[PDB]
Amino acid sequence: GMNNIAYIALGSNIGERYTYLTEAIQFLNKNPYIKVEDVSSVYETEPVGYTDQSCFLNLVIKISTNLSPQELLKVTQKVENDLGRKREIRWGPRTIDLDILLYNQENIEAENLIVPHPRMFERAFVIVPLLEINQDIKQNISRSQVEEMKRREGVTVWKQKN
């Protein structure tokens, strides 16, 4: 069994952005303890927090796993590492980011792991692709709240999922 469901957001704003994203999902999927169940469309998004840099490609995936939350976290960090994410980069451009957004319905408050992700409802580049693949959120947020945050933060479909 892989009884745990988790939602993960991916962003990239360096180089071949879509490649990093694509290789991130491939690396995750290659792990026998992770099954990728659904992937959002890919959105191009205006940089948040530090705007003097390239636009981002952002998506969100849903996975099934038998990994614990700390186990899942160490996998995503190994993936980040494999794709050349420099630990030191905080606000500027980076090859790849992985955020654990949701893990079942657990509320996690470890020193290194906060779930639900504390910024996810303040980021259109997370919420928009999340709603595409998570119907429980889809109701907890109006449809005009979704296209209203698209407009204000500058989030646009870059590649349709199929």
Which positions are catalytic? 85, 94, 97, 99
Residue 104 lies near ligand H73 (rule: CB under 6 A): no
Residue 119 lies near ligand H73 (rule: CB under 6 A): yes
Among residues 125, 138, 148, the alpha carbon closest in space to that of 59 is found at 125
Residues forming beta bridges with residue 98, ordered by sequence position: 10
Q: Judge if the upstream peptide bond of residue 116 is cis by omega within 30 degrees of 0.
A: yes
Q: Are 101 and 118 in contact (CB under 8 A)?
A: no
Q: Are 132 and 41 in contact (CB under 8 A)?
A: yes
| Tally: H helices and E strands in the chain | 5, 8
Residue 11 lies near ligand H73 (rule: CB under 6 A): yes
Give the residue with the Cβ less far from ligand H73, 3 or 112: 112
Task: Please state the closest distance from residue 1 (CB atom) to ligand H73, in A.
Answer: 24
Q: Tell me which of 115, 130, 133, 137 binds ligand H73, using CB under 6 A.
A: 115
Task: Please state the closest distance from residue 146 (CB atom) to ligand H73, in A.
Answer: 16
Residue 150 lies near ligand H73 (rule: CB under 6 A): no
Please, where are the H alpha helices in the chain?
17-30, 69-82, 124-133, 135-139, 143-153
Here's the x/- map for ligand H73, 55-94, by CB under 6 A: it reads as -x-x--------------------------------x---
Q: How far apart are CA 145 and CA 142, in angstroms?
A: 5
Task: Please state the closest distance from residue 100 (CB atom) to ligand H73, in A.
Answer: 4
Q: How far apart are CA 122 and CA 72, in angstroms?
A: 23
Task: Please state the closest distance from residue 118 (CB atom) to ligand H73, in A.
Answer: 7
Q: Tell me which of 2, 113, 141, 157 binds ligand H73, using CB under 6 A.
A: 113
- Which residues form the interface with ligand H73 (CB under 6 A)? 11, 45-50, 56, 58, 91, 97, 99-100, 112-115, 117, 119, 125
